[PDB]
């Protein structure tokens, strides 16, 4: 019918102008015949108009048209191994998302796509359904009901062309498993598309190195049950015949580096073919050519076979690339920590020729410091450049300081508060410091220490230390007499070799001694000095202040710091009295540990740890007892208390006493944890241990006081073993452990759950 104007009614989410545009029509004259077809096909191609109904009054066209209700919330019910983000990805693959209207009929196809995804997982019994919730404001909610069914196991892996040599058990080397021991349980038999792809070529690689060059596949076939419960897999192949090699030669440009590759290519004639040895040989050469300053050659290894004798001549060809240099260097990671700070460990240098190895030495030096969470290097090539190349060294920084907290747990600082903090990248500088302030409301002990490892260039390290200390607990005539003391340390340190370091320095101390108990074994040193105070008397007091010298030796060779995985780090220190001093003596302490993995792949790792401590003097000058070693505290000895090891006290009755002889170790099994994801599983470390330790003195005797035993022997060993979790948190390092001792020797104690804080070693 004739129309002069158009009106629409029932569209509350869209313009009428766009509405009247979607139907092309000639208004103010009799409009065409497609107005109905245009309203239909357009308003229902949009997916945004649910129903149209158009009529002509005679002068005006009234359109009565609804809008398809739009989805508000897309919800899921029956998720068990599946994440809604991936599901929304599959929806965006459908072309549907929140804030979208629809047909309510592709729901079947939606279900089908979901079930195809389920197939892609390895489930084929599942069933998905929609739940529609109509809602005002032209809205809908949608929920998804799942019934996942079940996946399959795998039943047989039998092979066509495996004759004359079985592997139907050695297949067990795969990712995939057609047998699940009930005594080796953590997975099961399940198919995967790609672990398949890996183990196929892996097996191929196996046979390619047992003397074959034709070990081929015909095809690969798979099926499973109607009930979709277990899978049947078969594969069709040729095992051909054996093969050997016969000589090797190469071709291509060098710089007369023939004699070195000559060493790397060296073999015996008539030896069994492999293919991996080949590859590593290539790559070793690539390292050499890194060193000489090449990046991008090409290398090809062509077998020239004679199956008439089952031999090969491996023709090889190289194309030594044109030389390179570097142009530029760039760094990323610096948000807080300045650059040139890291360059002073880059043994690669800018603006000259190059190694690909210096690169790695720098990578190493970086990963040593533990200042980063993670690290990334990269290397681009500059545009318009045959030989100039650039580089990037990226990192992810880390907050690495701490806040230590000793409370004299187990009473080696008694009831006390040792507070303090350490940071080695102080303010983004290479400046390094540590502090403690210690308070009990009557005792004080505060100490500061500092070092710039690069006070001056070439890794010149320079450190200082100070401490002031008063100890006051004889306010009720109790053990652990009153001492006040304060002093300093100074030190230089530097390396000479690119791993091995030395340092040395001095110190001066000042000591004030008061209200000594009448403990009996102590007074030996004091006789050694000279004096005899007690019958049981308590007016004792003494003073002494001394200079001293010390020195240190260091072997550090690791993948990294901060939860390392490989190598070993050991530090020894020897300290000594000097001439003029109030006394004369000298000691040595060593702390050792070493990391070795299986392959750093699944991270099954082991540590070995040991420390030694000893000292003695001369001229009748022995070391002090307050400078004794000590042990226990679940930092050195897990499952024992602080300084709670070794002999017992003596009056004219029991408390550990310290000494001069130590030997202690712990042997571990390192573990990952599958119950947490990588996001933080990377930043935590767990292990088991088995701990031994013992202590004594040689000057101590019991040939004379034989009413209580001797404590002079390396026997009488303290033994426990346990497990420990160590985890980082923004306040510093953290570690707990629970163990069980099983070899004591009378008069000793411990706890099972224990806690430690700060710098874990």
């Amino acid at each position: 019918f004739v129309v002069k104007d158009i009106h629409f009614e029932g569209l509350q989410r869209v313009a009428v102008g766009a509405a009247l545009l979607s139907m092309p029509v000639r208004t103010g004259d009799t409009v065409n015949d497609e107005d109905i077809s245009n309203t239909i096909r357009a308003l229902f191609a949009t997916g945004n108009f649910e129903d149209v109904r158009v009529l002509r009054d005679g002068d005006t066209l009234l359109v009565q048209v609804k809008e398809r209700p739009t989805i508000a919330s897309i919800t899921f019910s029956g998720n068990k191994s599946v994440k809604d983000d991936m599901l929304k990805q599959n929806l965006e693959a459908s072309g549907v998302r929140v804030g979208e209207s629809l047909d309510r009929t592709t729901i079947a196809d939606i279900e089908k796509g979901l079930e195809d995804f389920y197939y892609s997982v390895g489930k084929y019994s599942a069933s998905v359904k929609a739940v529609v919730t109509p809602l005002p404001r032209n809205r809908v909610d949608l929920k998804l009901v799942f019934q996942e069914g079940v996946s399959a196991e795998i039943q047989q892996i039998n092979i066509v062309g495996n004759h004359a040599f079985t592997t139907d058990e050695l297949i067990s080397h795969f990712q995939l498993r057609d047998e699940v021991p009930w005594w080796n349980v953590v997975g099961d038999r399940k198919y995967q598309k790609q672990k398949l792809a890996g183990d196929l070529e892996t097996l191929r690689s196996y046979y390619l190195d047992r003397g074959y060059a034709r070990f081929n596949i015909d095809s690969t076939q798979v099926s499973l049950t109607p009930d979709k419960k277990g899978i049947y897999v078969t594969v069709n192949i040729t095992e051909g015949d054996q093969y050997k090699l016969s000589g090797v030669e190469v071709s291509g440009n060098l710089a007369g580096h023939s004699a070195e590759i000559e060493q790397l290519t060296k073999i015996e004639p008539g030896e069994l073919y492999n293919g991996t040895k080949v590859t590593k040989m290539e790559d070793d050469i690539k390292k050499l050519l890194g060193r000489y300053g090449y990046a991008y050659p090409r290398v090809q290894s062509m077998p020239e076979i004679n199956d008439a004798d089952k031999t090969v001549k491996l023709r090889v060809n190289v194309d030594a690339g044109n030389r390179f240099y570097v142009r530029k260097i760039r760094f990323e990671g610096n948000d807080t920590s300045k650059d040139a700070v890291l360059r002073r460990e880059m043994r690669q240098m800018e603006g000259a020729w190059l190694g690909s190895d210096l690169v790695d030495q720098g990578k190493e030096r970086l990963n040593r410091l533990g200042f980063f969470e993670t690290v990334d290097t990269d290397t681009q090539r500059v545009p318009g450049s045959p030989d100039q190349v650039d580089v990037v060294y990226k990192v992810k920084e880390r907050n690495t300081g701490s806040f230590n907290f000793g409370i004299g747990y187990g009473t080696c600082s008694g009831v006390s508060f040792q507070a303090g903090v350490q940071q080695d990248n102080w303010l983004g500088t290479g400046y390094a410091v540590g502090i403690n302030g210690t308070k009990n409301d009557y005792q004080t002990y505060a100490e500061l220490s500092v070092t710039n490892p690069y006070f001056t260039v070439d890794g010149v390290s320079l450190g200082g230390r100070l401490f002031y200390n008063d100890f006051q607990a004889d306010d009720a005539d109790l053990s652990d007499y009153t001492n006040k003391s304060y002093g300093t340390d100074v030190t230089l340190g530097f390396p000479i070799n690119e791993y091995n370091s030395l340092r040395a320095g001095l110190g001066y101390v000042h000591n004030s001694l008061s209200n000594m108990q009448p403990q009996v074994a102590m007074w030996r040193y004091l006789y050694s000095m000279g004096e005899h105070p007690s019958t049981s008397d308590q007016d004792n007091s003494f003073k002494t202040d001394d200079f001293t010298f010390n020195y240190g030796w260091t072997y550090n060779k690791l993948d990294r710091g901060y939860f390392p995985t490989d190598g070993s780090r050991v530090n020894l220190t020897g300290k000594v009295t000097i001439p003029g001093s109030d006394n004369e003596y000298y000691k040595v302490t060593l702390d050792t540990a070493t990391y070795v993995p299986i392959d750093d792949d699944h991270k099954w790792v082991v540590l070995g740890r040991t420390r030694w401590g000893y000292g003695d003097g001369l001229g009748g000058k022995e070391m002090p007892f307050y400078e004794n070693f000590y042990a226990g505290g679940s930092s050195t000895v897990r499952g024992f208390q602080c300084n709670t090891i070794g002999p017992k006290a003596v009056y004219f009755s029991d408390d550990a006493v310290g000494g001069n002889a130590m030997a202690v170790a712990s042997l571990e099994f390192i573990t990952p944890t599958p119950f947490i994801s990588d996001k933080y599983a990377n930043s935590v470390r767990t292990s088991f241990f088995w701990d031994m330790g013992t202590v004594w003195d040689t000057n101590w005797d019991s040939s004379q006081y034989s009413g209580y035993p001797d404590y002079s022997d390396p026997s009488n060993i303290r033994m426990s073993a346990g497990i420990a979790l160590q985890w980082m948190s923004p306040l510093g390092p953290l570690v707990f452990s629970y163990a069980q001792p099983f070899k004591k020797y009378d008069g000793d104690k411990a706890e099972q759950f224990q806690f430690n804080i700060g710098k874990t070693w």
Partner: antibody
Framework: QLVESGGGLVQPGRSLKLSCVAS????????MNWIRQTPGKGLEWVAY????????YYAETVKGRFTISRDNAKNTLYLQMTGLRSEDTALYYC?????????????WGQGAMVTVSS | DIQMTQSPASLSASLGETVTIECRAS??????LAWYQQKPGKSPQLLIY???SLHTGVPSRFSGSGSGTQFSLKINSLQSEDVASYFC??????????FGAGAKLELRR
């Protein structure tokens, strides 16, 4: 090795500083004592100093009236004796101690007889 | 102080027989004694430390015996002129050091 001072004659109530010298060994340890023996066969420990002049202990007869000091530079022991009585007359020995065990002597002096008399 | 008992008195014996000189302690403490010999007109010298240990350079004959309550000095197959007056000394009580009475050794001719 150990050369000492004299003993002479004095009046009760007067003072006197006796010296005793150390010669070969270090002398910078060695708790030292003065011990007097009467011809009547009475042995009395009168004074002790140990390792240095930090701890000084006296017997319950002087009760501190006498003072014992030493000079390491001169390897000499100084004994200043305040108020003097007739009973104090005895043979006085400058005594040394025993290294690494202590609580007993190694070296003994010549013995010095002191005589107070009007 | 403390009763530093020395027994018996001054004795005499011939050459070759053994002698046991007793020194008794009032508070029964073990190994708190040292033995010293005074020759006439000679400086006194050390005999036994630890109340049972002999000092360097001297024959094995000398022995330290007895408990904290009571000790004895044993000379086995005693030889020639060794005659002196021998005393004990206690070091259990540091502030007051007590000696023995002294045993004056005479011989039998």
């Amino acid at each position: 090795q150990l050369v000492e001072s004299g003993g002479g004659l004095v009046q009760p109530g007067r003072s006197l500083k006796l010296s005793c010298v150390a010669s070969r060994f270090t002398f910078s340890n060695y708790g030292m004592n003065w011990i007097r023996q009467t011809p009547g066969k009475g042995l009395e420990w009168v004074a002790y100093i140990g390792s240095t002049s930090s701890h000084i202990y006296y017997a319950e007869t002087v009760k501190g009236r006498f003072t014992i000091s030493r000079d390491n530079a001169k390897n000499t022991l100084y004994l200043q004796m305040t108020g003097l009585r007739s009973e104090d007359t005895a043979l006085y020995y400058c005594v040394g101690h025993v290294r690494k065990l202590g609580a007993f002597f190694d070296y003994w002096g010549q013995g010095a007889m002191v005589t107070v008399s009007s | 102080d403390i009763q530093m008992t020395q027994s018996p008195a001054s004795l005499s014996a011939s050459l070759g027989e053994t002698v046991t000189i007793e020194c008794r302690a009032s508070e029964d403490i073990h190994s708190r004694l040292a033995w010293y010999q005074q020759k006439p007109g000679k400086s006194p010298q050390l005999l036994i430390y630890n109340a049972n240990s002999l000092h360097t350079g001297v024959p094995s004959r000398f022995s330290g015996s007895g408990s904290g309550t009571q000790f004895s000095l044993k000379i086995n197959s005693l030889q020639s002129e060794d005659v002196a007056s021998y005393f004990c000394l206690q070091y259990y009580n540091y502030p007051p050091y007590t000696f023995g009475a002294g045993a004056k050794l005479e011989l039998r001719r």
